[PDB]
Structures are given as structure tokens and as C-alpha cells.
């Protein structure tokens, strides 16, 4: 009976969503775990993400073969492709109401074995081209614009909340049946 409103804000350019296919939620009642993250590489016009998570060497690192077969690798590389999916909105609660924001991009990150490729290419060294191949060409022609990280924020929340229902946008010429017909 009690009204529980929600309002959609502006686009605020594009905010993406990362999904770690490998990292699960905690088996306990407190799934507040998040690995240390740094060295994020983005790639536009092909929608590529590369997230690097360093690993602690005091627990199950195998210091010998890591440098014997590869270089000084201590961080697994999570690569992902940002797929577009309309209708996906992220919601957060500031007051009794709910604030929504478009997502327009979701990426599932999976481990990438860059060191294996590097080792193979080092060991080996001693015309439309249409279709997805062309896209792959871009993916390995120019890429890897560097980017930083930031843990915790408030300016995004403030810029999403300053809408304060100034443009309620309640005007709607259609009705239930019209919307059903024009899905």
C-alpha cells in the first residue's frame, strides 16, 4: 500500500559492469571479499577490458616454474569483451526511493594466458579480409590505452542524485493496450 517510488537519472556517459566468472561469493554469510586490483587496460572501438590482479607469493605461488617457463609473472590477466545489452539498468538506494542508471555495456572477464602466447612467439622466432577476422585485426593492431583505478566514490552518486525529480517526465500519450500493441 505504501508508495515506494523510483526515478531514472541521466545517462552520465556510459558505466560498464564487470562479472568475474572465476571468483565466487563467500560460502559464509558475509560475502564481502574483493581482490586487490590495479593496472586496468581499456580498448575502445573493439570494447576490450584487461584487469590485472596481483597474487600473494606466501601461499601456493610455485616460484620456480613461474620464472623457468614464463617471465616474472605474479598476476593473472583477466580479459573480456564488452557486449552491448539494452534495457540493463543499475539501481541504488539513496532514500526511500530508488535511483536507476543505464548500463549499456556488460563484460564477463575470464583468465587470459598472455605469458603462454609470449613464450610461444619467442620460441617460434628462433584482400578485403572481411568478417569478424577484420574485427580481430583491429583487436591486435592498435589497443591498450592505459587507465587507473579508484576505490570508493561519491561524485557519481551525487551527479546521479542531483536530478531531484526536476523533470518527472510523466507525459505519456499511449495507454496499456497501446504499449502492449507497440512492444
Amino acid at each position: 500500500i505504501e508508495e515506494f517510488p523510483l526515478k531514472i537519472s541521466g545517462e552520465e556517459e556510459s558505466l560498464h559492469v564487470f562479472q568475474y566468472a572465476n571468483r565466487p561469493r563467500l560460502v559464509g554469510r558475509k560475502p564481502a571479499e574483493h581482490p586487490f586490483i590495479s593496472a586496468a587496460r581499456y580498448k575502445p572501438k573493439s570494447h576490450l577490458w584487461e584487469i590485472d590482479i596481483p597474487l600473494d607469493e606466501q601461499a601456493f605461488y610455485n616460484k620456480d616454474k613461474a620464472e623457468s617457463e614464463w617471465n616474472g609473472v605474479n598476476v593473472q590477466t583477466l580479459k573480456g569483451v564488452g557486449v552491448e545489452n539494452n534495457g540493463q539498468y543499475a539501481a541504488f538506494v539513496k532514500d526511500m526511493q530508488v535511483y536507476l542508471v543505464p548500463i549499456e555495456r556488460v563484460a564477463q572477464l575470464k583468465p587470459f594466458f598472455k605469458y603462454i602466447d609470449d613464450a610461444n612467439v619467442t620460441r617460434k622466432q628462433e584482400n578485403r579480409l572481411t568478417g569478424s577476422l577484420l574485427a580481430h585485426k583491429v583487436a591486435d593492431e592498435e589497443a591498450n590505452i592505459e587507465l587507473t583505478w579508484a576505490e570508493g566514490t561519491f561524485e557519481q552518486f551525487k551527479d546521479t542524485i542531483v536530478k531531484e525529480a526536476e523533470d518527472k517526465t510523466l507525459v505519456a500519450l499511449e495507454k496499456q493496450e497501446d504499449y502492449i500493441d507497440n512492444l
Binding site: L48, V106, P111, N120, H136
Partner: protein
Amino acid sequence: FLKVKGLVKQHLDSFNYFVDTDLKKIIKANQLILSDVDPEFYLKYVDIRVGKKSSSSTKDYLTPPHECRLRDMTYSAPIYVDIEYTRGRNIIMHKDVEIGRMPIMLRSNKCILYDADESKMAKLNECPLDPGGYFIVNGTEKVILVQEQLSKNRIIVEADEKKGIVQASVTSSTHERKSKTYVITKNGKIYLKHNSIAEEIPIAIVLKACGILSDLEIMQLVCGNDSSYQDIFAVNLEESSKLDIYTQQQALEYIGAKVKTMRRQKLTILQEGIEAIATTVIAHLTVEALDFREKALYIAMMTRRVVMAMYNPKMIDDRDYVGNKRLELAGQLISLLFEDLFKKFNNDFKLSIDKVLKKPNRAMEYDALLSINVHSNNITSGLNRAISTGNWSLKRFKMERAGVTHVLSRLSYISALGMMTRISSQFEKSRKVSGPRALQPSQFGMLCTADTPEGEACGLVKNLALMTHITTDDEEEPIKKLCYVLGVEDITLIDSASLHLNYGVYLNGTLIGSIRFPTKFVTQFRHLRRTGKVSEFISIYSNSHQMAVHIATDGGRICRPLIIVSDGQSRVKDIHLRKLLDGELDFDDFLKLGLVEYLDVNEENDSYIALYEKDIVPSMTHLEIEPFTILGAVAGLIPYPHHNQSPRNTYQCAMGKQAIGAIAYNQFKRIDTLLYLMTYPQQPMVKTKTIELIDYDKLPAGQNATVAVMSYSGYDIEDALVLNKSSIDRGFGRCETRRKTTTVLKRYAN
């Protein structure tokens, strides 16, 4: 239903849809011809029409079908295309020129007999009761028989226990490529054979190459959480590390190394291998992006089906199941033939243009449209010859089919009507295989359960029933958006762990996503279909053995109308029948008002159908309009067929075509090779509700003999009869045989 959608409607509707859509589709496909020299010279096919010179305002004059039949000509209409040819002064000019003559199917949107009523037909020497749907080529009535085939782009898994081998082949069929991607099981190890790769590639490697490289999401996409499946699939998960550990690029390189496909231009082995996954592996799905999750999950579902078959047989699907088969009519075959002929014509025209323009100087462009009229004989000659001889020679697919067209049978009226609406099995002989020749219960209402050439095609050749409508490709893109609105998460937003915890909705064979509450989704989609939001032929159903909500939209599915019943009671409500009998609600407002709906073979799995209104328990969701529509046009001849033994009904269906009698109203204005006629045909005493609809009481083949069932004279021991003289004298069984003899006074070259 038969007034709005006649018995011969597969051929008519398919040909009309062809001439209305596929002509322009092929035109826009091959809309441009280029050259290495003279970059400012191109031909643009703006528009194409059949029998319509420019505006005209009137269909061009066609030779009447009977005149074509008598003169041994070919019934056809001209094809007029638009022309855009440039000039050295860079001036674009337009023209409308004939490009050939396409044969016209009788009683189609192009034939003159379209909407002719008992006076135009009489003036054109055409029988009003003639079925139509057949071509007149070289003065011969040739009909393109409906071809049945396995469903394209669908998974068919057969467990060959004879060796312990199971498989997951898919005959993906595109407009250009058609290839089978089998997923066999050898040495307890799942593979993936192909006609373009070398030998038995392990499944783990192809799954890594398709994007799912985690090596644990494989176990969550092929086994879910069943312990009895993981141990079965654990055997082949270690082949991605036994040879050596793999990454996505390494797996692509490995699959491309053994690719047998040749490259006409130099491409890297990894580059080719990506192609081998991009398009070559599954022609059905082309992943022209940076994410291959759809193809990877498709292969994962194929492997899941294979593992399900491995753990316990009897979970496979029968190939002979009617819902697994599609029917291709004359329209699609003619579309293929015309596309091949048109591409050959364009290649020849471009070669001739390059040859003429090769001269360095004075390369005139005036009268550039001479070679097109020179070659316009080639297209029509090839079309007529391919239709007449029945040998459909194609090169794009390297497909050769023989006996597609049959000479229309003229013995009785029912023979000519039953040759139409006939289905030919794709199997050549099926010597001892008693599978495709059996009577599958799934064809109830879809195929005539009594009419079948007895003998050596006894089970291969089948005939359509009365209540039966063949589907056509409605849509594919809008339904994805409709599903996403309906509340299924996309395929790129569901983790592999929870992918097998709830029903996943498959749209036309390819996984789209997973949606909770499958019953609500199915009910809402069916309501949307009934209220008219989507096409009536889009069939959605639920499979529970593998949790799925399948949606089928492609044409060729066999559908029949059924009365929708709500909780406990029907929806006709006894007042819509009154309006139907009055003259309104011509079975189309019945679909618009959601009283009846088309069920195909697969959607009947989810339904509970009542034979009669008095049997409706408050759980059934459909009602039979009438149970006597399970028999075709021929089988409607039998009186009280539900009392006879089934082989008797089959023999009657076989021998009713070869019963002499009235053939057509113009049977005396007709010169055919061999006509049998009855002097005094008589309407049957014991009629049938079917024979009124097919007009068998207006052109009967038989007489009401006063039979006395009695052993008499001894000359009637084994099936022999005792005809009564003094009745033969008065005229009883009197018949006539008409035979034509043709003579051509050819003019020799001398």
C-alpha cells in the same frame, strides 16, 4: 477454412510469396555488376516485376493456359527489370527491359485464372473445378511435388547402440552454405567431425577456441551439477592438457592446423582457424563480432545432449518424428533455381561487357543492352528445361535432385487432386529400415493416415490432410526483442553455474537466455500470439526432459487449426457458429478473436486435446474441430471408413485414383495423351462430408450398381465378379478412351 485456404494452397501460396518477395530479394542481392576497368560503369537493378511492363496499369497479355496446353507452348509471363547504366559523360539513365519469361503456376497471383468466375473460365476453355498449382511447360502439366526433409539448423542426436556410439550432427543450412557439424563420441571421448576439418577434434579444445577457456565453466555448461554426468565428461576434459595446455589463441591455431579448407588468398593458420570457428564450423551461426559466447554455448548444448544420451539412452529424439521434419514447396525450389540462373546470367553478362569494353579506344556505350537480350533466351530456356525434366542441377550448393516435377495425373478428378498435395520422402529406397515407412502417431491431423502408394513406396510417399496449413518464415529479429521484453536475461548475462538451474528458452534452435517461471512465459507468449501481436504460425512449447522453452518461427512446419478451450469450456460459445453460418466471421475473425489457433506437431506435445466437446475435462487446452479431417482428399471417398479394416482403406486410397470417370468440364475440348471417360457417371448414394468439399459429387467416377451379395454361377470364386448382361447393353460401365497423336512438320536447315 477451405474457402479462405483451399486444398491446393501450399503451391499457390508458396509461388505467390516467391514472386512477391524472393524476386526482389535476389535482385537486391545481386544488384551490382562491376569491372576491373572503367570504374564509372555499373548496372543497378532498381526493381523487378513479373508480367508488368513499367506502370502499364494492366497485367501483360498472357497466352491462356489451355491454348498453351494445346499448342505445346509454355505458360509463362515476362520478367521486366529496371536498368541503371552510366555513360562516359557521367549521366545516369533508366530503362525497363524484359530479362526472360518465367513460367506461371496455374491460379496464382500472376495467372489470368486468378479470380475468374464461371464465365472467364468458360471463355478460356478452363475447368472451374480444376485444382491448379501446376505449371504448363512444353504443353505438359508438370507439378512440383512438396519435398519433405529433416529440419535445418536443428540438433538431431541418434544413439547407435550397435557400437556404443552417439552423435550430435546439425545440417546447418544457410542461403549459401550447408554442412553437417557432427559431435561423435569415440573412446568415451566427445569429438567434433566436419567436412572441412581433418579428423576428430577433441571437444575441450574447440570449446576453449570458442571462448569458454576457463576449463571449469566447461564442467558447468556440459554437466551442471549432476555427479553422474561429470565423471562421464571428465574423461575428455584432460585432452586439453594431455597434449599440452591450451589458451584461446593456441586452441584456434590447433583447430586451424588440421583445417582441410583451401585458401584462395594467403591467410595465416591462426587467421584461417578463427574462420573455421567464425563461419566454417556452423554455417547457421555467423559470429561477426569479438565475442563467440553464442556459438560456444551452442556447442556446449550439443555436448550436453550427447552426454545425456551417454548416461542413459532412450533420451534421444526420433528422426521420423513429424515435428522434426519440414516441407519445402514449389516456391522455395523455384527461388533456388532462379537465384542460380540469375547469378550465372549476371556472370555471363559481366564477362561479355568486359570483352566488349576491353578495346582501349572508341569503347562505345550505346546499345550496351544487346547482350542482355541475347542471353535472355538462356535464362528462360534453363528455367523451362529444369522444370520440365525434373533434374534440378545447381552449382552453388553442388546439389543434384531428380524427379522434382511429375506429370500431372489425369485418370479421374480425385487422381488429379491427390497428385497435388502429395509429399515425397527424402529417402531414396529405405530398403529394410522400417522407421520412415511406419505410421507415426505424431502425424494425427497432419498427414492422411490411410493414403499411401501401396507397394515399394508404401510409407515413403504421404499426402496432406484436410485441416493442414504449411507455415512460412514469419520473423526472426522481432521475436528476440519480444522475448527480452518478456523477461529472459540475455545470453551474455548468465553465469555457467546457474545456466542449468532453470529453463533456457531456445529461439529457433539457438540458445537465447534463461528465464525463471517458464509456465508464465509460455502462457504470456501464447496470449500474445492469440491476440494477434505476432504471426499465428510462431509456435512456442515447453520441453521438460531438458528444461527448455522452444520457439519455432521458420516455415515448413505443418500446422492445423484447433478450437481454444478455456477452463472447463470452449470458446466458440455457440453464437460465433451462428455468425459463421450467417456469412460473417470467415475463419479469419475466428483467429483475430482468439477462438481457434494453429498447432504444429511440436506444440501438440504441451497440449491436451479433446476429441469431442462432451469429453472436455477442466484440464484440456484444445478441442478438435472434427475428427474426420485426419483423412486426405482421396480417403474421403470411402463410405464409413471407420468400420473397415485399415488395409482395405489403404487399397481404396490407392485404386481410387485409377477409377475411370468424369475428369473436367472441358474434357471434350482437351487433347491429352490418354484420357479415360465414363459415358454415364453417377453421383454416389452414400456420400461423405469430404466429397462435397472436394466437389466429387459433381465429377464422379462410378455408378450405383444394384449388388446382390451371393455366391452365384461359380465364376466369382476369388474376387471375381458376375456382371449382369442386359445392363451392360443398357449402358453400365460403358467407357471411352481418347489418345492423342502429335506430328511436327519441322523445317530443316536446308
